[PDB]
Amino acid sequence: IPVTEEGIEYRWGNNPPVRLWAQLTTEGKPHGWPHEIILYYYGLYPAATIAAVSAAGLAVVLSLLASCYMFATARRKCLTPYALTPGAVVPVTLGVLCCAPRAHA
Amino acid sequence: YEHTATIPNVVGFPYKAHIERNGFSPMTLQLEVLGTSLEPTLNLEYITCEYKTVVPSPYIKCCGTSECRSMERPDYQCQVYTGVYPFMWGGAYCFCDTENTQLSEAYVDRSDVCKHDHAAAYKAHTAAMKATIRISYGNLNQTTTAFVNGEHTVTVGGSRFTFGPISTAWTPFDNKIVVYKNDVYNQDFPPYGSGQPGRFGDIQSRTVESKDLYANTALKLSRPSSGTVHVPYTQTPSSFKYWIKERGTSLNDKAPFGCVIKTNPVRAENCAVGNIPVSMDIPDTAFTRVIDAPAVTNLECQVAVCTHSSDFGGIATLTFKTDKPGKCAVHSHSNVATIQEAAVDIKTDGKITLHFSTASASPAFKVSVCSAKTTCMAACEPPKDHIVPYGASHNNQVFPDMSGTAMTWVQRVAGGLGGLTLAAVAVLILVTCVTMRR
Amino acid sequence: YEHTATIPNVVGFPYKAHIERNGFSPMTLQLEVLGTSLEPTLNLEYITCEYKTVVPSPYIKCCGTSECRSMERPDYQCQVYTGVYPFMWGGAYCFCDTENTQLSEAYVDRSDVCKHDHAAAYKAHTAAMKATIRISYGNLNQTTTAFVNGEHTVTVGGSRFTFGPISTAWTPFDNKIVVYKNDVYNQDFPPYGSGQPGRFGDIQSRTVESKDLYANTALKLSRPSSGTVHVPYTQTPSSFKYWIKERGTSLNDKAPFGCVIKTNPVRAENCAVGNIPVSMDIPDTAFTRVIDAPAVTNLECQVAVCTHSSDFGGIATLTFKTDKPGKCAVHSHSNVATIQEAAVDIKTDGKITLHFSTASASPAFKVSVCSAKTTCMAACEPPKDHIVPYGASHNNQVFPDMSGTAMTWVQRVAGGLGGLTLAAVAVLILVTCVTMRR
Numbered sequence: 001i002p003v004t005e006e007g008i009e010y011r012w013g014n015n016p017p018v019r020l021w022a023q024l025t026t027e028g029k030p031h032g033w034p035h036e037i038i039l040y041y042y043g044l045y046p047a048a049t050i051a052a053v054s055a056a057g058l059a060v061v062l063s064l065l066a067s068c069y070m071f072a073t074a075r076r077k078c079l080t081p082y083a084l085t086p087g088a089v090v091p092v093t094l095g096v097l098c099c100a101p102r103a104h105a
Numbered sequence: 106y107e108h109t110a111t112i113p114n115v116v117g118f119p120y121k122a123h124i125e126r127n128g129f130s131p132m133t134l135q136l137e138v139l140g141t142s143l144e145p146t147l148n149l150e151y152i153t154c155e156y157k158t159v160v161p162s163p164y165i166k167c168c169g170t171s172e173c174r175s176m177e178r179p180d181y182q183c184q185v186y187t188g189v190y191p192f193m194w195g196g197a198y199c200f201c202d203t204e205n206t207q208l209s210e211a212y213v214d215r216s217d218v219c220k221h222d223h224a225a226a227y228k229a230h231t232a233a234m235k236a237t238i239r240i241s242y243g244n245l246n247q248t249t250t251a252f253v254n255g256e257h258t259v260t261v262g263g264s265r266f267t268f269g270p271i272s273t274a275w276t277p278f279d280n281k282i283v284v285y286k287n288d289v290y291n292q293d294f295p296p297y298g299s300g301q302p303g304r305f306g307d308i309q310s311r312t313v314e315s316k317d318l319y320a321n322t323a324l325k326l327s328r329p330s331s332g333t334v335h336v337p338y339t340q341t342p343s344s345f346k347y348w349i350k351e352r353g354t355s356l357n358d359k360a361p362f363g364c365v366i367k368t369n370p371v372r373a374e375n376c377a378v379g380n381i382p383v384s385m386d387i388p389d390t391a392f393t394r395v396i397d398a399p400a401v402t403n404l405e406c407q408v409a410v411c412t413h414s415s416d417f418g419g420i421a422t423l424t425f426k427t428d429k430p431g432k433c434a435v436h437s438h439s440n441v442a443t444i445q446e447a448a449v450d451i452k453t454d455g456k457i458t459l460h461f462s463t464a465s466a467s468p469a470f471k472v473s474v475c476s477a478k479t480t481c482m483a484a485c486e487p488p489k490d491h492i493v494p495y496g497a498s499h500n501n502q503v504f505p506d507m508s509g510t511a512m513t514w515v516q517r518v519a520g521g522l523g524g525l526t527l528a529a530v531a532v533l534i535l536v537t538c539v540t541m542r543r
Numbered sequence: 544y545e546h547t548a549t550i551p552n553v554v555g556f557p558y559k560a561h562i563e564r565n566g567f568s569p570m571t572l573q574l575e576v577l578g579t580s581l582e583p584t585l586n587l588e589y590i591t592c593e594y595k596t597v598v599p600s601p602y603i604k605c606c607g608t609s610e611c612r613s614m615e616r617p618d619y620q621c622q623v624y625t626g627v628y629p630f631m632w633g634g635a636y637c638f639c640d641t642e643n644t645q646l647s648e649a650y651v652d653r654s655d656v657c658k659h660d661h662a663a664a665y666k667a668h669t670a671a672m673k674a675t676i677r678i679s680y681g682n683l684n685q686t687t688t689a690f691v692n693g694e695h696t697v698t699v700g701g702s703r704f705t706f707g708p709i710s711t712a713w714t715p716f717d718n719k720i721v722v723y724k725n726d727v728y729n730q731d732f733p734p735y736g737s738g739q740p741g742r743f744g745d746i747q748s749r750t751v752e753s754k755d756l757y758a759n760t761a762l763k764l765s766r767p768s769s770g771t772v773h774v775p776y777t778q779t780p781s782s783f784k785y786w787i788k789e790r791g792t793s794l795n796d797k798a799p800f801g802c803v804i805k806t807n808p809v810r811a812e813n814c815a816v817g818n819i820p821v822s823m824d825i826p827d828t829a830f831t832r833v834i835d836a837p838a839v840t841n842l843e844c845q846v847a848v849c850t851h852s853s854d855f856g857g858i859a860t861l862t863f864k865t866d867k868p869g870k871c872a873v874h875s876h877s878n879v880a881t882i883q884e885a886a887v888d889i890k891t892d893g894k895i896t897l898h899f900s901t902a903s904a905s906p907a908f909k910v911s912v913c914s915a916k917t918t919c920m921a922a923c924e925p926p927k928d929h930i931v932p933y934g935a936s937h938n939n940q941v942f943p944d945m946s947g948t949a950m951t952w953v954q955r956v957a958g959g960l961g962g963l964t965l966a967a968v969a970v971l972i973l974v975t976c977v978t979m980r981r
């Protein structure tokens with residue numbers, strides 16, 4: 001018989017009815033490593049923990065590119081005006097901006 | 106004094122209400138509901154028993170003919186037959202060979218023992234909920250009953266409580282009730298004047314002892330075969346004894362919210378749904394003044410076990426600094442954990458324990474002893490069981506709010522990744538003004 | 544055979560319903576309501592009488608003292624005094640000067656005629672309307688009663704009827720009801736356990752005979768004066784004798800839709816609201832086949848009088864070409880006029896008389912006698928009497944059809960300038976097609 005959380009009653013033959021509720025045990029391990037803390041929230045709510053971890057995963061790879069896309073935009077606005085006219089690339093900036101006009105460019 | 110609270114509708118579960126006013130000591134309460142039985146406003150529409158086909162001895166007149174009388178009974182069926190020859194036990198019967206009629210009649214009425222066992226068809230359109238509440242404070246310990254609507258008022262010690270209207274309006278009775286002995290069948294029985302032979306309600310009388318019986322059981326006669334003094338009749342059998350054995354289960358055995366269903370003033374007791382608003386009218390002769398209450402300072406809380414078990418898994422060693430022996434009234438203020446015994450005593454050295462029951466990995470609640478507050482913290486562990494006979498004693502709140510292990514790794518990632526997205530926005534202001542001005 | 548109709552709810556108003564089918568003569572019915580009750584679904588909140596305060600004989604004590612008792616009683620109040628000097632009739636009575644107390648005691652209960660006269664307080668949440676329709680067709684008049692909701696089913700002769708639900712669900716009561724002897728009062732009474740002194744509900748008991756009386760009539764028990772033997776007190780007066788005078792009217796004298804309000808099985812009989820749907824089940828052995836009916840050809844009607852009076856103030860005359868005498872059934876295919884008597888007897892000569900009743904200046908009703916139709920038009924005149932003692936037999940409709948004299952002048956103004964408006968368009972169409980191109 002599936003005893004989910006709110007319990008069942010069941011009557012066998014002519015005995016009085018018996019009610020049995022479900023405890024809130026699990027299989028994982030709380031208060032430990034970040035990889036074994038997901039298994040603790042996996043026996044508890046096994047289908048509502050994938051939609052939670054994906055929005056905590058999509059918020060990481062999106063916010064990581066949007067800092068580098070602002071890096072490459074801000075890198076461009078310091079290398080371009082020293083690349084139109086014939087002139088040196090000022091190696092003071094080479095230590096900061098690892099400029100693609102390195103050696104013969 | 107006036108105070109409002111909303112107890113849950115769980116049978117056999119204590120609730121703590123806490124009263125704080127000016128000048129007096131903080132005082133807790135403990136309301137507990139014992140039984141809850143709602144009944145609809147019934148009205149009997151008909152009564153069904155077995156039937157009893159009465160038929161008298163047949164009449165044979167052999168000198169001449171006869172005619173039917175055509176009286177009025179429920180299923181009064183006369184039919185006269187032509188020339189017969191009865192063949193009684195000694196020789197012939199009526200000393201001729203033809204020209205002899207035979208008047209045969211039969212009809213139906215209500216059973217003999219109908220007032221003892223009988224089905225009844227009521228109607229459920231409203232409801233009327235009653236309850237039974239144990240009220241506890243100080244040295245007052247009583248138990249009363251009151252209608253759960255905003256018009257009834259009970260007095261217990263010197264106060265005047267009033268229980269508000271129910272949140273929901275849910276009844277497991279659909280509209281209609283069929284009671285036989287100890288059981289309600291959630292049916293859609295045919296109305297008075299639409300009986301069907303074999304299905305339920307072929308005998309419908311308006312009440313138990315009245316007249317005007319209604320019956321259509323298709324009582325059709327036939328002629329006797331050749332030479333026997335009998336009377337044949339064919340009709341569909343008793344519908345009421347179909348229903349005693351064809352009944353699967355009552356509404357008792359499939360009611361939604363754990364309800365059980367009794368029968369004599371037809372009702373459905375101990376149903377756990379919704380919540381009850383209350384209204385309190387405790388006078389000022391029950392409180393204690395802050396002069397006589399022991400002033401308690403320098404609170405501290407620490408735990409040792411915190412099991413997720415349903416009863417009271419978790420101990421809490423709690424210290425303080427008092428001056429006078431007296432009496433306090435503990436309480437929490439958050440629905441993450443619940444506190445037992447509500448009124449624990451005091452001692453000069455601060456060493457008293459508590460039994461909480463939380464249901465999350467890291468609870469964070471707050472305790473007031475005698476207007477003297479603190480917070481608590483725990484590192485709870487799961488229990489090694491699966492099926493428990495008793496029921497829960499905690500409000501469900503699974504959220505490790507702002508300090509646990511499951512929160513610290515979230516704050517380091519989102520406080521470490523977010524610090525490098527806005528840092529590129531700083532570089533987007535740092536460089537672009539220098540280029541543009543140059 | 545099956546047929547449905549709807550009848551208006553006004554009492555003493557014969558309605559006609561028409562039945563047409565292939566292979567039989569047309570047939571008309573005559574439904575006519577004769578009474579209508581409306582019982583709410585009661586439940587006695589409480590019942591109210593006129594109380595009786597019993598002051599027993601005061602018990603003195605001449606040397607010792609006495610103490611209070613704390614008995615169990617509705618508004619019990621006893622309290623003892625200090626030394627009093629009684630001085631009854633001849634000389635003193637305790638023969639001391641002090642230390643002789645006099646215990647006083649008083650309480651209240653219900654009356655002695657409380658089972659005879661009483662106000663009864665009910666609650667009206669639902670209501671079940673009955674009716675007393677009589678049914679007329681052919682040579683059959685019966686009169687049956689039925690609960691007016693769409694499932695109860697009654698039989699008349701050899702046919703069966705049922706009556707649908709009432710259109711609205713309006714009540715002349717409200718959810719509160721006060722029943723004394725012949726006058727239900729639609730007043731929101733104060734609830735149980737919250738009675739107020741002086742106003743209606745000072746004493747309250749749950750049913751007619753029970754314990755647990757409730758009362759707060761503000762009984763105060765003052766101190767006896769100088770040397771006479773009497774127990775004085777003071778009390779707010781009986782509320783129920785104020786409510787017998789300060790009752791303004793009944794609800795019979797301010798009921799909304801003109802409905803008398805009886806009292807003993809609390810009722811609301813003969814209202815006037817909405818309409819009632821019906822359902823017919825006339826079997827095939829009630830019509831006439833089309834061969835047996837008298838054939839009717841070449842109808843032509845011609846009005847004579849037509850006043851607007853509330854009775855049948857109109858006489859028409861019809862001609863025809865029949866072939867055999869018989870009995871037709873007339874009907875009106877409009878809600879403008881209602882032909883009376885429905886059951887004319889056709890003869891050899893082509894001349895019959897009817898009686899109709901309109902409410903507008905020009906009718907357009909059309910008459911079927913026996914599967915043959917014609918149209919009637921009249922020029923009608925208003926009556927002279929202003930106040931009439933009987934009701935209204937027509938339907939409330941005031942609109943001349945299309946060819947009345949009051950509307951003929953409209954078409955001689957509409958076609959006049961409307962035909963001149965298109966003529967002013969047709970000039971511009973010619974100009975904007977000849978000298979937009981030349």
Ligand SMILES: *[C@@H]1O[C@H](CO)[C@@H](O[C@@H]2O[C@H](CO)[C@@H](O[C@@H]3O[C@H](CO[C@H]4O[C@H](CO)[C@@H](O)[C@H](O)[C@@H]4O)[C@@H](O)[C@H](O[C@H]4O[C@H](CO)[C@@H](O)[C@H](O)[C@@H]4O)[C@@H]3O)[C@H](O)[C@H]2NC(C)=O)[C@H](O)[C@H]1NC(C)=O
Nearest residue numbers: 119135136137239240241242243244245246247248446447
């Ligand atoms: C005033 O307020 C107090 C507390 O607020 C209430 O006191 C409690 O009342 C309940 C019920 O009356 C008491 O429960 C009873 O306990 C008895 C002894 O308990 C021992 O045995 C049980 C059973 O193994 C153990 O679980 C427990 O730990 C103890 O070891 C039981 O013997 C009683 O059972 C009886 O009744 C049941 C059905 O009711 C029968 O089936 C049994 O056969 C037996 O007859 C019962 O369980 C409880 O002990 C009281 N005290 C406390 C501190 O909770 C008062 O009810 C309340 N009102 C008054 C005084 O009017």
Ligand SMILES: *[C@@H]1O[C@H](CO)[C@@H](O[C@@H]2O[C@H](CO)[C@@H](O[C@@H]3O[C@H](CO[C@H]4O[C@H](CO)[C@@H](O)[C@H](O)[C@@H]4O)[C@@H](O)[C@H](O[C@H]4O[C@H](CO)[C@@H](O)[C@H](O)[C@@H]4O)[C@@H]3O)[C@H](O)[C@H]2NC(C)=O)[C@H](O)[C@H]1NC(C)=O
Nearest residue numbers: 555557573575577677678679680681682683684685686886
């Ligand atoms: C259809 O169904 C009914 C079954 O009852 C039958 O027709 C009914 O016949 C009865 C009499 O047999 C009618 O009842 C009485 O009619 C009397 C005759 O009315 C004359 O007098 C009055 C009064 O002056 C005039 O207005 C009228 O024009 C006639 O000249 C009435 O005098 C009776 O009055 C009673 O009630 C009034 C209150 O209304 C009291 O004040 C009186 O004192 C008295 O008690 C009464 O009305 C009845 O009206 C008929 N019902 C109909 C026609 O629907 C038929 O037999 C049946 N049809 C067939 C084919 O069988």
